[PDB]
Amino acid sequence: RVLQLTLGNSTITTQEAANSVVAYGRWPEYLRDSPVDQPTEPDVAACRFYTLDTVSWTKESRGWWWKLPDALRDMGLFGQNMYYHYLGRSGYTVHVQCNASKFHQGALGVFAVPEMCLAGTSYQNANPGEKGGTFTGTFCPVDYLLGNGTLLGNAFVFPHQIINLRTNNCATLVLPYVNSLSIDSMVKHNNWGIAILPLAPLNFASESSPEIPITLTIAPMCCEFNGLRNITLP
Amino acid sequence: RVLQLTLGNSTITTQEAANSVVAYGRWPEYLRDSPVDQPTEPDVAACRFYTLDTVSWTKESRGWWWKLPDALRDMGLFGQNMYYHYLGRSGYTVHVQCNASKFHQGALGVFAVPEMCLAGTSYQNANPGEKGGTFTGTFCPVDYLLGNGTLLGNAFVFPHQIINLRTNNCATLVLPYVNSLSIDSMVKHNNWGIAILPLAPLNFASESSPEIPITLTIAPMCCEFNGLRNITLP
Amino acid sequence: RSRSESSIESFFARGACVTIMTVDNPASTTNKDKLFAVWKITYKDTVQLRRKLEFFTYSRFDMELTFVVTANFTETNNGHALNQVYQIMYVPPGAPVPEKWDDYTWQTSSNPSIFYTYGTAPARISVPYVGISNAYSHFYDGFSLNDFGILAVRVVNDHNPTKVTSKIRVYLKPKHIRVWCPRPPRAVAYY
Amino acid sequence: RSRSESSIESFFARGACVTIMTVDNPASTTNKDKLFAVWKITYKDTVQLRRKLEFFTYSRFDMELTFVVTANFTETNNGHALNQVYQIMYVPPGAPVPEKWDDYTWQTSSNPSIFYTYGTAPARISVPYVGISNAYSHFYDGFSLNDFGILAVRVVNDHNPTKVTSKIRVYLKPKHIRVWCPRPPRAVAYY
Amino acid sequence: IDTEGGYISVFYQTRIVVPLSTPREMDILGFVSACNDFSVRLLRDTTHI
């Protein structure tokens, strides 16, 4: 069975979004009552599954990472909205599938990390746009650290899902908007940050594709923006 | 008394739109029933009063003219819509005021002309964009002809209104969409064309502004576009 | 007083020769190309009709076409011949138009055809509105004029050894007309 | 939008000259065999019709046949003659076809006949479906193609001393058609 | 006749990964047809020789 999800001009097929995890079990929604609260609401075409360029997981692949909204600082509309607008706030459904054959043992951890400050500093350095940033096992923040001198084994606190190949081959984190504010400048501040690390090292059979692809399908949800609308009076 | 008309981010003050004329007494509206008819409906921000650069009417001014939609081939949004879209159709309220002092005798005729083929040939030649095109009294199509070797005196057939200065100083034509089709390529085909000619020659008192300004405030109404939306099926 | 005589129809509806197609009997001797004559139906030649139409911007109209044929021998010689018969081909818009005398197009099933035998009741057919759009236009303010097909005529009797020229007046007469957006009329002069 | 213009009829139903029978006046002088001309009605010559038919495997159709006749003297001589009259014989399937000019077959009562006097309204008849089976076939996968009769034409005025050749176009036009088992169409090329 | 109509492209989104010696040469077939809304008008045969 395969569900075919649609968001206007975009469509994604999904085996079974049974293993969907909403971070902190909070579904993303708009700003509740708590016009005057300037909720410019363009939930039309900026809410379509976008697809980042796939990375090629290999034997010695350390890991990948993308900041959000950053990633979509170009995905057409949404990327636009993050300029004609000063303020905004979107949740996001991140949908990571990585099709592989039944002969590829391996396992990835997808970690959504609120305010993912990757340590070891210059805007561009920490914003790899749409191609994401990679880790290293010794610029590239240390993998088993996630920049921040932490022991990997604890990552699992952060909304996470494990793509153990000999089972599900997809994963879907659902991040809701999270921040110390109620709305904010979507451009200069990346609420989330998705890191994908290989837990079990990718291994396969003799003559088989030695580099399985993994795609990210980030769809901004219930997004909104500030206001330019002023007011007049007679 | 002055009415203050609003269309989102734009606002126009108008003395009294009492002398408003709808061409052929047909108000512009959308495509009636006569989704399947692919009526992509973005009647949001493309429907705001735009304002063309004012022309300076003088003694020896012959006349001016603008093709529509052409004119708005740049007025932000609407101009955009005429590219991301293949098909479209908009009416328009054209609102021509020309503030002058009580000491300026003069009179203009505003003529809306469906399919205004200005004769004497190269796209750019017949599409002066937003600054409009001017006439001449002998490139510049002959004024008392409107290109087409016609006698001026008959213009009045075409939806028209006369700005006789010693009376109303504004004029508002309301064109509805007109064409041999039901929808069309807004870009390569100018449904209307507004020509403003001075009937009574502009004259004034000794030391007074010798060049009264006339502004055009074209607001596209009930506009719509073709479709990119395809369809899938299991 | 009444308006009747000036309604749209009463105005437009009027037989008007719009052209004279001329062909020559396929005299195997020296007939060069007069073998067949072909005309693309367009008002743009008859000032008269043309003018009345440009009084508006748009219009629809089932056009009816009558045919009057007239022959005569070119040589005062003992010109004998058997009653000839003309073929009248209507070529609907966007269809190939004959080139040769015996181009396959005459045979081609699409084209409605007429075999008028000389000296008889004038031939007649009536193509309905054939605009691809919703009305023929008379003016345009865009880039890449409409079609109404082509007439094609050719004699069918073949090896006649006596040249027999023939004119064919076409009398087009707009029927069921309807117009839109009147415009000032052009001075008689420019045409 | 509507489908009408592409229904089976609207598609097939179209006058198409399928051949030109040519005969000569029985000029007792030297006329050899052009005395009469005979054609076995078969689509298999008009690529056009042929093709549209092979789009299917089976079909039934009352065929209507019009006749257009055209004469002219062969000699520029003072060619005189009285309005000739042609005989048009329809020979239903499995019937003997004329051989001589004056073979008994012209007289034979079975054969429906037409006497068209030159220079008049084109002759016309319409044989109904005449398949011995339940539909004409277009393809066969067995052993020992169908018939639709024969046309036969001969001039009737006899001792004319002026040779008068005449073509007779036949304009067959399928009517009340019905088809079965559509098949991919053959490339224009092979015919 | 001749000039628009649109296009349809197919992009490798991800490489076509496979298990064992299975060949790295798949193939794809393409179909086309009309839907109920399709219709035609003004017949015009051209076939000749």
> Number of helix segments of chain C?
2
- Report the principal-axis shape of chain C: elongated
Taking the alpha carbons of the first and last residues of chain A, their distance comes to 62 Å
> Radius of gyration of chain C, Cα only, in angstroms?
19 Å
Q: Give the helices and strands of chain C as they follow along the chain.
A: HEEHEEEEEEE
Count of domains of chain C: 1
Helix/strand-derived category of chain A reads: mainly beta
Summarize the structure.
The structure is cut from a larger assembly and holds 2 copies of chain A (234 residues), 2 copies of chain C (191 residues) and 1 copy of chain E (49 residues). Chain A is mainly beta and 234 residues long. Chain A contains 1 helix and 15 strands; from the N terminus they run E-E-E-E-E-H-E-E-E-E-E-E-E-E-E-E.
Description:
Chain A has 234 residues and is mostly beta strands. In chain A, 4% of the residues lie in helices and 30% in strands. Chain A has one helix spanning 76-84; strands at residues 3-7, 10-14, 20-22, 55-56, 64-68, 88-97, 104-105, 107-112, 133-134, 160-164, 170-175, 192-198, 203-204, 213-216, 219-225. In chain A, the strands form four sheets. In chain A, strands 3, 4, 6, 11, 14 and 15 form a six-stranded mixed β-sheet that branches. In chain A, strands 9-5-12-8-10 form a five-stranded antiparallel β-sheet, with no helix packed on it. Chain A is globular. Chain C has one domain. Chain C has two helices and nine strands, in the order αββαβββββββ. By secondary structure, chain C is mainly β. Chain C is 7% helix and 39% strand. Chain C starts with 7 loop residues before the first helix and ends in a 9-residue tail after the last strand. In chain C, strands 1, 3, 6, 7 and 9 form a five-stranded antiparallel β-sheet that branches. The two termini of chain E are 20 Å apart. With 49 residues, chain E is low in regular secondary structure. Chain E has no helix or strand. The B-C interface holds B 24, 67, 113-117, 123, 126, 148-151, 154-155, 157-158, 178, 180-182, 185, 188-191, 193 and C 57-58, 131, 133-137, 139-143, 180-187, 189-190. Chains C, D: It comes from Poliovirus type 1 (strain Mahoney). Chains C, D: This is Capsid protein VP1. Chains C, D: It is found in: Virion; Host cytoplasm.
